[PDB]
């Protein structure tokens, strides 16, 4: 996308979202990042939404095939390996964008927590399919990225901040689904929900809506886990 203007890539990424063309959206936002310039708050959302959709469809297809494989020629394993390899390529692509050079140039808490949360998410997606000599190192890479984002968010963001809430939500899912730490998952979601509850009185009606929506997602997981 080196020959297209930065503004045109952003413009076409928003059009791709409207058309539900998420692979195009990710390719447009990949080219926008590779222009070398930092991303605005809205542009960070476009990057996250694009790749979360692409990898989300890959994860759903991987789980369908892995379930058929476990119920059970080499066709099922070959095709699962095919989807798994393409999923790992997308995760590696996002992690490469964060490492070159989004994270090192993110100085504000809003941007740095956002990118480190992404880094934990896409290492978590790699962990969902890992079975070899790297599984433990991938899990620790996800934990380390989540933990740094947690440390900054607790120091620099109010308890009701949507990025802080979504970070704690996904980190709690990491504890439950990846790290085999359901008690850590329940404690984080509960502490996050309660501290956000006590901070709701400071918010406007629009910020109140933003925070309570994510707080309900934490409540949904707690109801499922307890």
């Amino acid at each position: 996308m080196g020959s297209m203007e930065r503004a045109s890539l952003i413009q076409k990424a928003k059009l791709a979202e409207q058309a539900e063309r998420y692979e195009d959206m990710a390719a447009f936002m990949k080219g926008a990042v590779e222009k070398g310039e930092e991303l605005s708050c809205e542009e960070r959302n476009l990057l996250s939404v694009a790749y979360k959709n692409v990898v989300g469809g890959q994860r759903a297809a991987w789980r369908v095939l892995s379930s058929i494989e476990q119920k059970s020629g080499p066709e099922v394993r070959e095709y699962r390996e095919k989807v798994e390899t393409e999923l790992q390529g997308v995760c590696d692509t996002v992690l490469g964008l964060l490492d070159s050079h989004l994270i090192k140039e993110a100085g504000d808490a809003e941007s740095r927590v956002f990118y480190l949360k992404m880094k934990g998410d896409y290492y978590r997606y790699l962990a969902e399919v890992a079975t070899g000599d790297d599984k433990k190192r991938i899990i620790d890479s996800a934990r380390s990225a989540y933990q740094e984002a947690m440390d900054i968010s607790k120091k620099e963001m109010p308890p009701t901040n949507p990025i802080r809430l979504g970070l704690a939500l996904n980190f709690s899912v990491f504890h439950y689904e990846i790290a085999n730490s359901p008690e850590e998952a329940i404690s984080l979601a509960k502490t996050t929900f309660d501290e956000a509850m006590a901070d709701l009185h400071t918010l406007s009606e629009d910020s109140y809506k933003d925070s309570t929506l994510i707080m309900q997602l934490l409540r949904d997981n707690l109801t499922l886990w307890t």
């Binding site: 979202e17 998420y22 939404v49 979360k52 959709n53 989300g56 998410d121 979504g166 939500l169 996904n170 899912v173 439950y176 689904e177 994510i214 997602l217 949904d220 997981n221 499922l224 886990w225």
Partner: peptide, 8 residues
């Protein structure tokens, strides 16, 4: 266990 929903 639900993570942050992808799209909007």
């Amino acid at each position: 266990a639900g993570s942050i929903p992808g799209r909007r």
